[model samples]
Target: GPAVGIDLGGTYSCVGVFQHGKVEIIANDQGNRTTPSYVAFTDTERLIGDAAKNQVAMNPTNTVFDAKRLIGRRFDDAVVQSDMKHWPFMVVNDAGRPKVQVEYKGETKSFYPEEVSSMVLTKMKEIAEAYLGKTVTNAVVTVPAYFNDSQRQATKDAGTIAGLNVLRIINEPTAAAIAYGLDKKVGAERNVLIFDLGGGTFDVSILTIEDGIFEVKSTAGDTHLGGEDFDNRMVNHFIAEFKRKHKKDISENKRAVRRLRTACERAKRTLSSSTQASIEIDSLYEGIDFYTSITRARFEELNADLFRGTLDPVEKALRDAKLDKSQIHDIVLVGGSTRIPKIQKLLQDFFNGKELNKSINPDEAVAYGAAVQAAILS
Candidate 1:
């Protein structure tokens, strides 16, 4: 393969190719498009993946996953502080620059976001190089459309660390729209709104396509808003629910909270396709049991704040695009959260019964679009 497309996301890194006029997922000798964006070093200092991700919660201080948020940020940046408060490691100063400091294997080390991100990016490239059996260099990468200059620079720096010749860095939402437009036979004059809410970010973008040209009319979003936040809310709800049921406060225990948090994440995914999901937590508060129910309606109600958060960008995009609600010719949903029926209904209500488009798979649409752009550019 001469050209590759990469989606180096907060939680995952996906690499694929554009060959013979088709986009294909090259399976690493193991056959996987998704790789956990994690790096772990053994006591001996050997690197590992999949296996490394398994130890993240245990070695939360050393195993980093979400470095994308801290890259090129100041210690007091409201968003960075918010993330820092929850991360297991501390964000400290390293020669006047923000750095993640962690104690691992009896040693303290400071790592910049770019340095950690480069580890994940390099791993993905290794997979591509091994699978293609060639020295692959050309690539198109996607970044959250709303990323500021500093964050964008950090991402580009990560590319250089991976030894990649960055061909183009496209906006994640624009890429999704491109993939959907091409798949659904988008017309030259059609205008569409793209709603993208992923694990770590939220974006609302308006775009128009005409005569083989794609133009972004306006974009707005919060880098800190996403499914992870909703998951945290659910975890809190369970803590309260468990306390009520057991007549004991189990929320005071960190280990119990972490286990409940994991259970909450799973329940959130399950409730997406079911009316109700049950979570059972054992060994809480020294063998106390906690069970809770999360119905689809309960989820919608509890996460209403998040749903409302999406409207800020929607309103912002409308103001910037100067388009009436009716002018949004179509609504395209991007990101895995779009799979939730409640999210779909909420979007439909906002658009006043206008049809929603799903011509592209929320997971791979952005990468596919990046691949097409790489092909055109190459």
Candidate 2:
């Protein structure tokens, strides 16, 4: 039997191999680093990963991420409404029960969030089993710490759906910290703060590391906030610019909105390295032309409010953990969105002038950390 570690995220899933003392990337039987956390049942059949995610642009109702947010909650639950507006899927009243719909093949199919999660989990399991060239069992997963009981339960159901015995559902930040601290060979007695900003959510955690005993002192974040929000803001900027030239409000068109959504995503990645990024949203609607050039500075300005929003949580973490910014021993950054220069500078300001450590790849660190945990368990 092989020990596998899986990171079940709202946006993507990663599975890895950890045996003896090493961690290896367990290629998905599909041969991908990450699989979109989505599932689709078509008129003819079912689809997962890229196929399911591709349909999201055309079929927002079925493709789902953050499905963990809906488990065990009533349709009218405030949390459900909060996520309803932005998520590509709809949280609607189906047969008196709240469910989401997606376009699979050419038909609309309704599924509970748990059902979707399970599909993604099963795919990861197949990937791990194939990579190890053996039947792999016994796995651990990670979730946002702030997730409530319903959300946690939904996550476990996903594991069962994938047919793996879940050894644990660890918090996101702590997992990333474990992966980095151990790799850097940091002393067990050290204390550190892990700032995780993933695609769909943000998490901040303070932990004490000692002789491999990791204790989380506190965790804080906005489950609905992350890189996606930044992308949306960029899309808004593009929309405003397009209106200025086209002399009409282009934001009202769903197809145009979707196209801007794509353009914003592409520009976001380009601005990370280039000073100016020119992206086309292609033709969203019949005769609607969408395109724009965005600068890193322009993107940063539009999202200043969201960046400001993060400060509240940082202060809340410090207060809850009973530590001053100056007292934090080390600041570790995790998650792809943290790659933004503005986010980095914000952390520096909050930490009483201490710079955050970028030694770990935000994209790969969490899964690596989860792999470390798997090694320890084995």
Q: Who wins the TM-score comparison?
A: 2
* True-structure lDDT of candidate 1: 0.76
Candidate 2 wrong stretches, greater than 4 Å: 26-32, 72-77, 81-110, 148-150, 182-189, 284-291
**lDDT digits (tens) for residues 229-287 of candidate 2:** 99888877777777787777777777677767877877887887787888865565567
lDDT against the true structure, each candidate: 0.76, 0.76
Tens digit of lDDT per residue, candidate 1, span 1-378?
377778878776677777787776555445656676776654556254565666665666677778888877776787776787787767886665678776656777878888888887777778878877898777888887667888888888888888888888888877777665433444547777889887777788888777756678998888778787888889878778777777777766766777887788788889878999998877766688776678988988899978866877888898899998888887888776777777788788877898787756566667777777777778
Give candidate 1 regions above 4 Å deviation: 25-33, 40-53, 74-83, 127-135, 182-189, 289-292
Clashing residue pairs, backbone N/CA/C < 3 A, model 1 = 188-210
Count clashing pairs, candidate 2.
9
TM, every model: 0.86, 0.87
* Top lDDT prediction, candidate number: 1
RMSD of each: 3.1, 3.1
* Residue pairs that clash (backbone atoms under 3 angstroms), model 2: 42-104, 42-105, 61-101, 61-102, 62-101, 62-102, 188-209, 188-210, 188-211
Steric clashes per prediction:
1, 9
